[PDB]
Amino acid sequence: HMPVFHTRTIESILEPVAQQISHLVIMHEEGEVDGKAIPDLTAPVAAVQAAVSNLVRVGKETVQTTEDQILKRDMPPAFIKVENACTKLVQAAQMLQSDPYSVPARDYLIDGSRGILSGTSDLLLTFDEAEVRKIIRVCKGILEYLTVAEVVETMEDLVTYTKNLGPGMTKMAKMIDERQQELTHQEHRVMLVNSMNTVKELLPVLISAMKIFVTTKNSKNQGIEEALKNRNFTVEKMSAEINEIIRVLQLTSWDEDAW
Amino acid sequence: PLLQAAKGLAGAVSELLRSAQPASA
């Protein structure tokens, strides 16, 4: 029933509130505590309404500013969730201001607080899925560009190829590095990291195979097909490493049912 | 930004739960 926090960022933001809810429940099992009046919660609830309203606007701005259709589809249901839970909190504060000892008002308080927790988790998760999709798009870009190696036959096209690829790789590596730090499972971290390391080591090897090929074509020594094949093998081993990374990232997410 | 907005909501809910504790206990 209680939501699962998948990344370290999400855990840091939500875990403490989840703990606070449990503390309140446990506190209420003690005889000295249950029976006591819940103080006036009008103002503290007004603060929550204000923060919910801010979160919904920021989310709506995030929905109207993105190309991510999956995001545009998933966020709204989460807005409905937190708003509904917020409504319960507002109701409970009303009930508790006339009857500070209501047991059903206290239940509304806990249910509203739990609902906000899970609605916020869902929202943070959706936003996290989308960030991961951005990383996957970059990897997929690099994967596509790796096949451009097949149309490179001149030394000039090679220099262009190298100019364009190097920075794409550097950017992929940074994103993977950032991502590995969000993960809660070491299994995935080392997979991602070792794969990225292998692709980085293969780059100069690919660029060298492409050069040998161009040179051979020019100089004409007859060994052109060996050169092509070797270049293709390199592209092939790099492409498999990247596909592995894409797959681990997809495994590291897709998490919620939504989309 | 979204992350800061969620931190603010988590903050408001924590303060609310803390205020719900009896005066005093």
From Swiss-Prot, chain A:
Region (Talin-interaction) residue spans = 169-209
Record's comment on post-translational modification: Phosphorylated; on serines, threonines and tyrosines.
Give the top-rank taxon of the lineage listed in the UniProt record for this protein: Eukaryota
List residues modified as Phosphoserine.
Answer: 98
The entry's note on the tissues where this protein occurs is:
Metavinculin is muscle-specific.
Q: Which residues carry this modification: N6-acetyllysine?
A: 174
Localization: Cell membrane; Cell junction, Adherens junction; Cell junction, Focal adhesion; Cytoplasm, Cytoskeleton
Task: Describe the subunit structure.
Answer: Exhibits self-association properties. Part of a complex composed of THSD1, PTK2/FAK1, TLN1 and VCL. Interacts with APBB1IP and NRAP. Interacts with TLN1. Interacts with CTNNB1 and this interaction is necessary for its localization to the cell-cell junctions and for its function in regulating cell surface expression of E-cadherin. Interacts with SYNM. Interacts with SORBS1. Interacts with CTNNA1. Binds to ACTN4; this interaction triggers conformational changes. Interacts with FLII.
The disease this record links to the protein is: Cardiomyopathy, dilated, 1W: A disorder characterized by ventricular dilation and impaired systolic function, resulting in congestive heart failure and arrhythmia. Patients are at risk of premature death.
What the entry says about domains is: Exists in at least two conformations. When in the closed, 'inactive' conformation, extensive interactions between the head and tail domains prevent detectable binding to most of its ligands. It takes on an 'active' conformation after cooperative and simultaneous binding of two different ligands. This activation involves displacement of the head-tail interactions and leads to a significant accumulation of ternary complexes. The active form then binds a number of proteins that have both signaling and structural roles that are essential for cell adhesion.
What job does this protein perform? Actin filament (F-actin)-binding protein involved in cell-matrix adhesion and cell-cell adhesion. Regulates cell-surface E-cadherin expression and potentiates mechanosensing by the E-cadherin complex. May also play important roles in cell morphology and locomotion.
Task: Indicate the family of this protein.
Answer: Belongs to the vinculin/alpha-catenin family.
Name of the protein this chain belongs to: Vinculin
Organism in which the protein naturally occurs: Homo sapiens (Human)
Q: Which residues of the full protein are shown?
A: 1 to 258 of 1134
UniProtKB/Swiss-Prot annotation, chain B:
The record's subcellular locations are:
Cell projection, Ruffle membrane; Cytoplasm, Cytoskeleton; Cell surface; Cell junction, Focal adhesion
Q: Which residues carry this modification: Phosphoserine?
A: 14
- Please explain the role this protein plays, according to its UniProt record: High molecular weight cytoskeletal protein concentrated at regions of cell-matrix and cell-cell contacts. Involved in connections of major cytoskeletal structures to the plasma membrane. With KANK1 co-organize the assembly of cortical microtubule stabilizing complexes (CMSCs) positioned to control microtubule-actin crosstalk at focal adhesions (FAs) rims.
What does the UniProt entry state concerning the protein's domains? Consists of an N-terminal FERM domain linked via a short unstructured region to a large flexible C-terminal rod which contains 13 amphipathic helical bundles (R1-R13). The rod begins with a five-helix bundle (R1) followed by three four-helix bundles (R2-R4). These are followed by a series of eight five-helix bundles (R5-R7 and R9-R13) in which the N- and C-termini are positioned at opposite ends of the bundle, creating a linear chain. The four-helix bundle R8 does not disrupt the chain because it is inserted into a loop in the R7 five-helix bundle.
Which proteins does it associate with, and in what oligomeric form?
A: Part of a complex composed of THSD1, PTK2/FAK1, TLN1 and VCL. Interacts with THSD1; this promotes interaction with PTK2/FAK1 and VCL. Binds with high affinity to VCL and with low affinity to integrins. Interacts with APBB1IP; this inhibits VCL binding. Interacts with PTK2/FAK1. Interacts with PIP5K1C and NRAP. Interacts with LAYN. Interacts with SYNM. Interacts with ITGB1; the interaction is prevented by competitive binding of ITGB1BP1. Interacts with SVEP1.
What is the recorded name of this protein? Talin-1
Q: Which organism is it from?
A: Homo sapiens (Human)
* Protein encoded by which gene: TLN1
Portion of the full sequence shown: 607 to 631 of 2541
